[PDB]
Design a protein around this ligand. Structure first.
Ligand SMILES: *[C@@H]1O[C@H](CO)[C@@H](O)[C@H](O)[C@H]1NC(C)=O
Lengths: 40, 50
């Protein structure tokens, strides 16, 4: 089996304001994304 | 919780069907300030705390 740990990304997290879970966002395959942040 | 050390819950990212609590017979009192309890189902807030 395999194990994954987010503790190598951050040591801790507090005061969480938002959470969302869905399906994965991600010859060879080319993946393109656009990230915008408008009006919150 | 005890009154000197009251607890808080944060409510977000949900649909607040306030009519469920307003029309409940399990309460002895229900009073609102700054808002009417019969209009709550038509309102949106940035945060709700209980
Ligand atoms: C959590 O974050 C919100 C938004 O920045 C802030 O208003 C609130 O005071 C923070 N809570 C704590 C305990 O820091």
């Amino acid at each position: 089996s395999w194990m994954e740990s987010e503790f190598r990304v951050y040591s801790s997290a507090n005061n969480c304001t938002f959470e969302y879970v869905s399906q994965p966002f991600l010859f060879k395959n080319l993946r393109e994304f656009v990230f915008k942040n408008i009006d919150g | 919780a005890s009154v000197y050390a009251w607890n808080r819950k944060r409510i977000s990212n949900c649909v607040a069907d306030y009519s469920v609590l307003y029309n409940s017979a399990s309460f002895s009192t229900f009073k609102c300030y700054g808002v009417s309890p019969t209009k709550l189902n038509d309102l949106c807030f940035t945060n709700v705390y209980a």
